[PDB]
Design a protein around this ligand. Structure first.
Ligand SMILES: *CCC(=O)N1Cc2nc(-c3cccc(/C=C/c4ncc(C5CC5)o4)c3)n(-c3ccncc3)c2C1
Length: 273
């Protein structure tokens, strides 16, 4: 289900990366009663962020550990949690980091099938969260992880729900009132697709966070990337509608993006293809 990692169960090695939230460390975790060495990534979360007590956090982590059964190949599994002064999250180690970095470092080699199938997998896993009523809140190309170039997963789901900010990914009702629903993640999915279609480009590049709220009221959304056909941009702009119910569901996106993958040369225009 989810182990409670004692400080002496896991080891730390290189810092895979460090952000505002805290740090992510590559390392070796050995379970309570086993001789197996496990390659893990330890998300060190910064102290004094959650008003909730460590017990209130732990029980809530066990509720979010239910999503790991039956599970989905495009949703991550929390291998275990450690609760000292900070919250350290332990999962299996993705060697190929996140999709945002991947689509940046391999921009020229990335094809139309690779791109459209990534949208497919992400929608499949995002739908799986909607099946368990877990609202992600923070869906971005940096939160999509790569296990293999042909297999992606979603991480950091409900971590805001666990402890309580990307304004460019958030929908208007989240920017203004912080109301997160499964339909809000469709807007964030829309931003995520645009990110893949722009090989890691910053959403609303340069435009200050304070402007974004009032800038979206003026009707302006993300600009259409040159690789997307009009049929793909209708899906991205569908997700960016004002009404939450006007945006599509993750079930609809699974069918549409797989239908689109049944002739990618008709939906994505690039070199090599
Ligand atoms: C481009 C690289 C990048 O930005 N990332 C982001 C990131 N996060 C993680 C990672 C590491 C350890 C644990 C977790 C998440 C745990 C989690 N999320 C939700 C929940 C439960 C429901 C409450 O637990 C994320 N990695 C990462 C993962 C694996 N190996 C390396 C790096 C990256 C890459």
């Amino acid at each position: 289900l989810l182990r409670i990692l004692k400080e002496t169960e896991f080891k730390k090695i290189k810092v895979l990366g460090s952000g505002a939230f805290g740090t992510v460390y590559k390392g070796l975790w050995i379970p309570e009663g086993e001789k197996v060495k496990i390659p893990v990534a330890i998300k060190e979360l910064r102290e004094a962020t959650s008003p909730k007590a460590n017990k209130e956090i732990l029980d809530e982590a066990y509720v979010m550990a239910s999503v790991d059964n039956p599970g989905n190949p495009h949703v991550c599994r929390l291998l275990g949690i450690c609760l000292t002064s900070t919250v350290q999250l332990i999962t299996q180690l993705m060697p190929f980091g996140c999709l945002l970095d991947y689509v940046r470092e391999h921009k020229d080699n990335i094809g139309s099938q690779y791109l459209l199938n990534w949208c497919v997998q992400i929608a499949k896993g995002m739908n799986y969260l909607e099946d368990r009523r877990l609202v992600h809140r923070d869906l971005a190309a940096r939160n999509v992880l790569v296990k293999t170039p042909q297999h992606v997963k979603i991480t950091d789901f409900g971590l805001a729900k666990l402890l309580g900010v990307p304004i460019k990914w958030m929908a208007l009702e989240s920017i203004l009132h912080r109301i997160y629903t499964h339909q809000s993640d469709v807007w964030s999915y829309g931003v995520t697709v645009w990110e893949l279609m722009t090989f890691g480009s910053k959403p609303y590049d340069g435009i200050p966070a304070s402007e974004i709220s009032s800038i979206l009221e003026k009707g302006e959304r993300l600009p259409q990337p040159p690789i997307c056909t009009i049929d793909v941009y209708m899906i991205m702009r569908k997700c960016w509608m004002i009404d939450a119910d006007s945006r599509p569901k993750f079930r609809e996106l699974i069918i549409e993006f797989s239908k689109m993958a049944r002739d990618p040369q008709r939906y994505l225009v690039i070199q090599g293809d």
